[PDB]
Amino acid sequence: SSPMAGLEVLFASAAPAITCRQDALVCFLHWEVVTHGYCGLGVGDQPGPNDKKSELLPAGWNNNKDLYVLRYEYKDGSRKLLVKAITVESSMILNVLEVADLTLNLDDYIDAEHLGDFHRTYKNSEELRSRIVSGIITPIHEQWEKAN
Amino acid sequence: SSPMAGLEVLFASAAPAITCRQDALVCFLHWEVVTHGYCGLGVGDQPGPNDKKSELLPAGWNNNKDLYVLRYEYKDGSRKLLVKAITVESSMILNVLEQVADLTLNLDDYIDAEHLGDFHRTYKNSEELRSRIVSGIITPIHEQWEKAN
Amino acid sequence: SSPMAGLEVLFASAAPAITCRQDALVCFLHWEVVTHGYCGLGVGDQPGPNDKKSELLPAGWNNNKDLYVLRYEYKDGSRKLLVKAITVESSMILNVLEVADLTLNLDDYIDAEHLGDFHRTYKNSEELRSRIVSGIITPIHEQWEKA
Amino acid sequence: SPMAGLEVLFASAAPAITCRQDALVCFLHWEVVTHGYCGLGVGDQPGPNDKKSELLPAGWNNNKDLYVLRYEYKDGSRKLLVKAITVESSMILNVLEQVADLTLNLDDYIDAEHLGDFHRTYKNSEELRSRIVSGIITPIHEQWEKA
């Protein structure tokens, strides 16, 4: 239901941090999570002093191109998520623990030749949105419904 | 319906440009417009070669603290908006045209002067502000359009 | 008490970004603040998402050569500092709010023709330390005493 | 005598840090610097790259199995030869001024998983400080109080 309105602004905000295909994919994923009601908390599997509840990409989010570990919390709630994006050659393995998983090929969704051009960075973005929603977002929301 | 998800990112993206209460109010207004299906094109009354379709605040948006003139194009196709935010004492008069919805907002009730550049303390009565902008600006434009279509 | 050990490393962590006398003076002041128990938080009057507790100079610290506004927080989080370095002609006025005021003539402390050389950049450094400590550090600490 | 400056030093060193030993030597270097010594260079004897500085000396990490670093007292002539010797998952530290020795398990102080990330690189850092001080720094300082 929700738009991805804000992705262009987020992408521009992360321009100096986006150096590889994985950075661009994680940027997109982050905004999918935010637009579905979550706020970023920080990086790593545990709270640090740098933790801030925010829409922005957490400081240090892009410091490991092989493994992205980002924590989230429901906007006006206490519900928490641990999101991992794991690089495996030209693919990323996405998984979330509140354990939904999803494997994406970077070549299918990111154009490496145009990382500096937002309008040509993402390919098949509508399909990317649906796979992230059905593979990541929806399972989380349904686990929420069952336990009430 | 739509949220204001992205306002925090927008505000951060424009923080150096935000030097007065009016800048902060217009920033808020801009995102209300974008989240309701529009893209920013540019500034002033006149379309020109420096127009660029974007979610970002257009270059020069904050140059006149007395009169903000922003143009928008619907993300889908060629529908258009001309937004004017007019500073009057401690208030701003908003008028929008594609036909002209008019809304007056007291800055004292929506912007904290003391903590201006602090995002989480900049805006007061945000939910009322959203409601009034949607009721006063967004919905009338949409409905007059539906009547015309 | 505390030495200024780390100043050279800090300066080296800034030299490609240091472009004028004021940058070098602010870098020195920053280390006086850090070595006396504070962490750099960010720049400007207001907190932002770019805020980060660090010994390092905050991102954007030298954006404005006329006015440096830096925020600090004590290492335990008990107190905060708003530090302003104001360029006035050949001098800088330093005021810190937790108002401590101190005026430094750049001609007497910074060598403008060797800004890329750490060992020739600073002059009368012992006097500089002493004046910053007695003018800024100590009275800030003692304003914290009376609370 | 704080370890203020360690974060700044680490940032300067991180692009060249590729193993656990690199990170431990960086920490040891700052312990030595903050206790009054400046680095001079590498190897048993002075080389053309010698330079009295707080910074990690040129070529400090060319050999991951054996780190050989020379120091000299700040504003003084007293010299130290520090060796860090890799033995599997441990390092043997000794100082020549002969005088000091200390064995450290890397598993105990360096997180392999988070090496390039400062705040998660060092484990049990307070214990590390105390052992380096008692094992290395103090005997040196005690040496300087006899004969």
| Residue written as token pair 């794991």 | A86
Chain B from 13 to 42: CB within 8 A of any A CB: 13, 34-35
| Residue written as token pair 């143009």 | B71
d(CA C12, CA C7): 8
Q: How many CB atoms lie within 10 A of CB B31?
A: 26
- Please, are residues B46 and B81 in contact by the beta-carbon 8 Å criterion? no
Using CA coordinates, name the residue in chain D closest to A61.
D117
Alpha-helical segments (H) within A5-67:
7-13, 21-35
Q: How many CB atoms lie within 10 A of CB C77?
A: 10
Q: Is A110 helix (H, G, I), strand (E, B) or coil?
A: strand
Nearest C-alpha neighbor of D105 from the set D8, D48, D20: D20
D116, A63: Cβ pair inside 8 Å? yes
Tokens standing for residue A94 = 């996405």
CA distance to partner chain B, nearest, from residue C42 (Å): 13
Q: What is the DSSP letter of D113?
A: G
CATH number (3.40.1000.30, 3.40.50.1240, 3.40.50.150, 3.40.50.10420) of C1-147 reads: 3.40.1000.30
d(CA A53, CA B5): 13
d(CA C137, CA C98): 11
d(CA B95, CA B114): 27
Give the orientation angle of helix B21-34 with respect to helix B126-133, to 10 degrees.
60
Q: Where are the beta strands (DSSP E) in chain D?
A: 37-42, 66-73, 79-87, 90-96, 100-105
B2, A2: Cβ pair inside 8 Å? yes
* Chain C touched by D137 (CB under 8 Å): no
CA distance to partner chain C, nearest, from residue B110 (Å): 18
B37: left (phi over 0), alpha (psi -120 to 50) or beta: left
Q: List beta partners, residue B67.
A: B86
Tokens standing for residue C93 = 């006025």
CATH topology classification for B1-149: Protein Transport Mog1p; Chain A (3.40.1000)
| Enclosing H/E stretch for A143 | helix A138-147
Using CA coordinates, name the residue in chain A closest to C75.
A49
Nearest C-alpha neighbor of D118 from the set C54, C111, A70, C74: C54
A49, C53: Cβ pair inside 8 Å? yes
* Burial status of residue D12 (CB atoms within 10 A of its CB: 0-12, 13-18, 19 or more): middle
Q: What angle do CA C124, C130, C131 make, to 5 degrees?
A: 90
* Chain C touched by A59 (CB under 8 Å): yes
Q: To the nearest 10°, report the CA torsion of D103, D107, D113, D118.
A: -40
* Chain A touched by D116 (CB under 8 Å): yes
* Burial status of residue A78 (CB atoms within 10 A of its CB: 0-12, 13-18, 19 or more): exposed
* Chain A touched by D146 (CB under 8 Å): no
| Enclosing H/E stretch for C42 | strand C38-43
Q: To the nearest 10°, report the CA torsion of D28, D31, D37, D38.
A: 60
d(CA C118, CA C11): 7
A120 backbone dihedrals φ, ψ, rounded to 5°: -125, 0
| Enclosing H/E stretch for C143 | helix C138-145
D116, A60: Cβ pair inside 8 Å? no
d(CA C93, CA C22): 11
Whether chain B lies against chain D with 3 or more Cβ pairs closer than 8 A is no
Q: What is the DSSP letter of C8?
A: H
C47: left (phi over 0), alpha (psi -120 to 50) or beta: beta
Tokens standing for residue B111 = 């912007």
Q: How many CB atoms lie within 10 A of CB C108?
A: 12
Give the orientation angle of helix D6-13 with respect to helix D20-34, to 10 degrees.
140
Q: What angle do CA A56, A60, A64 make, to 5 degrees?
A: 125
Which residues lie below 8 Å from residue B46, measured CB to CB, with a gap of 6+?
Answer: none
Q: Is C122 helix (H, G, I), strand (E, B) or coil?
A: strand
Q: What is the DSSP letter of A89?
A: T
CA distance to partner chain B, nearest, from residue A10 (Å): 6
Q: List beta partners, residue D32.
A: none
Tokens standing for residue C78 = 């008990």
Q: How many CB atoms lie within 10 A of CB C42?
A: 22
Helix and strand totals (H; E) in chain D: 6, 5
* Exp. method: X-ray
CATH number (3.40.50.300, 3.40.1000.30, 2.40.50.100, 3.50.50.60) of A1-148 reads: 3.40.1000.30
d(CA D62, CA D56): 12
Q: How many CA atoms lie within 13 A of B39 on its CB side?
A: 16
Tokens standing for residue B89 = 């004492």
CA distance to partner chain D, nearest, from residue C112 (Å): 22
d(CA A133, CA A135): 6
| Residue written as token pair 């306002």 | B7
Using CA coordinates, name the residue in chain A closest to B32.
A5
Q: Where are the beta strands (DSSP E) in chain B?
A: 38-43, 67-74, 80-88, 91-97, 100-106
Q: Is A124 helix (H, G, I), strand (E, B) or coil?
A: coil
Q: List beta partners, residue D53.
A: D39
Resolution of the experimentally solved model in angstroms: 2.0
